[PDB]
């Protein structure tokens, strides 16, 4: 398949793997979102000038572990992690 | 860890289009439409999401110059999942 097709299918596969464990298959607890980021993006780490934002982001996931997130908010979390951990965005003001 | 490469690929596609000219952190809605149509060419809406899909695509055409940042581009990919991926068939 085309590269973005494979990628977006994989973003949905990972969501199904976690959200589909039990309960509402369209929801993740933030605790499960943090688990998913930690295991599935284990090697992603903030770029040189984004440590503080990244640390605040991860901090907010712990403090609201029981709040739920839907798929669109899961994808948003992925996007934020790109802003903090992908070199393309290092100069993004 | 397949999610790593998938998320890396979402950035790569953004950079290909946003890198054409001007601000490398922005796309115009016309560019976003072009990207979704080309790069997800085989993805089509599920039976009961065709109205929503067609509405979404047509909105891009009514303000072709508006800027989309990376987070909004990723939100658009999430919308296309809701409309085109059978996992979301029961999703309100």
Curated annotation (Swiss-Prot), chain A:
SMART domains: S_100
Positions where N-acetylalanine occurs in the chain: 1
S-S bonds: 29-67
Tissue-level expression: Skin specific, specifically expressed at the inner endocuticle of hair fibers.
Binding residue positions for Zn(2+): 82, 85-86, 92
PTM annotation (Citrulline): residues: 50
Gene3D superfamilies given in the database record: EF-hand
GO CC list: cytosol; Golgi apparatus; plasma membrane
CDD domains, per the entry: S-100 (cd00213)
Post-translational modification: More than half of the arginine residues undergo citrullination by PAD1 and PAD2. Arg-50 is specifically citrullinated by PAD3 and promotes tetramerization.
Keyword Transferase: no
Keywords: Acetylation, Calcium, Citrullination, Cytoplasm, Disulfide bond, Metal-binding, Repeat, Zinc
Domain EF-hand: 11-46, 49-84
PANTHER family: PROTEIN S100-A3, S100 CALCIUM-BINDING PROTEIN
Function: Binds both calcium and zinc. May be involved in calcium-dependent cuticle cell differentiation, hair shaft and hair cuticular barrier formation.
Protein name in UniProt: Protein S100-A3
């Amino acid at each position: 398949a085309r590269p973005l097709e494979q990628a977006v299918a994989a973003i949905v596969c990972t969501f199904q793997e976690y959200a589909g464990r039990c309960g509402d298959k369209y929801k993740l607890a933030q605790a499960e979102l943090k688990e998913l980021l930690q295991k599935e993006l284990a090697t992603w780490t903030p770029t040189e000038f984004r440590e503080c934002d990244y640390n605040k982001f991860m901090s907010v996931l712990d403090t609201n572990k029981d709040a739920e997130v839907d798929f669109v908010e899961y994808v948003r979390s992925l996007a934020c992690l790109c802003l903090y951990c992908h070199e393309y965005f290092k100069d993004c003001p």
